[PDB]
Structure 1
Amino acid sequence: SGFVCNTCPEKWINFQRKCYYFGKGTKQWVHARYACDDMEGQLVSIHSPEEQDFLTKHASHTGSWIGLRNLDLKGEFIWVDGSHVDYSNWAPGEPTSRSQGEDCVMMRGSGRWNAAFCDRKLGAWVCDRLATCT
């Protein structure tokens, strides 16, 4: 068993179909997106409890930016990478307990998600990309 494509860049960690990068250093949501982009990845999208568990396990104990955003003024949250929102792991009350304009999402040390202002400075951020074929 396994995945035929399972190769990851150095400093990245493979999990199933994808590779993950756990970034450190204070960034607002958009700068975080840039850091992922510059490494040819994207802010992470999450599609299963198994992925979430792997992330909770490896991710910063403080908060991390992920690639989930509300862009349409109707509070519909979508992944930056065009994937759609099947799985969710929201904290209690979230996301509707958020304020108008809180268009971004962070992942807590526990793994659960909470909407947050995009201009928050967080000390961690998670990128992913598809594992390469060899």
Structure 2
Amino acid sequence: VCNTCPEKWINFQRKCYYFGKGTKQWVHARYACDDMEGQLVSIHSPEEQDFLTKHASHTGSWIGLRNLDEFIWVDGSHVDYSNWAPGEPTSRSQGEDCVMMRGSGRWNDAFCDRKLGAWVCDRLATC
């Protein structure tokens, strides 16, 4: 059984999630996750998305998705499952390289220096 979570983290399947609060730019949230032995959340299934939507802040949260050159998760994994809001991401939005999750759970690309009140970390559950 792999459902062991560190204190303050919530289990879902083989992963642990941390629903962070506090005003952060994308890179500030990326390091807040790293310093807690986690990473900004990577989403790989509609079941995982549904669980996140249920615990997510109504005012928007940073997720581990970013445009490098192609959108890639901070942990290195490529996008299989996606939950972009209609029309997203837009090709012509130069500089809107980071991804936030709305209260609905749908994804929007955004300027990296935008300050959001929430961010979500993930890590593997222990046994």
TM-score w.r.t. the length of structure 1 is: 0.92
1:98 Cα deviation from its structure 2 partner: 5.7
Number of equivalenced pairs: 127
CA deviation profile, 1:90-125 (whole Å, cap 9, x unmatched): 001001266112110000000000000000000000
Distance 1:71 1:97, change over 3 A: closer
1:82 Cα deviation from its structure 2 partner: 1.0
1:83 Cα deviation from its structure 2 partner: 1.4
TM-score w.r.t. the length of structure 2 is: 0.97
Structure-2 separation of matches of 1:98 and 1:62: 25
SS at match of 1:7: coil
Structure-2 separation of matches of 1:115 and 1:97: 10
8 Å CA contact retained: 1:62, 1:123: yes
The match for 1:90 is: 84
Task: Give the 4+ runs in structure 1 shifted more than 2 A.
Answer: none
SS at match of 2:34: helix
8 Å CA contact retained: 1:104, 1:118: yes
8 Å CA contact retained: 1:98, 1:116: no
CA deviation profile, 1:71-97 (whole Å, cap 9, x unmatched): 11xxx1110101121000000100126
8 Å CA contact retained: 2:71, 2:78: no
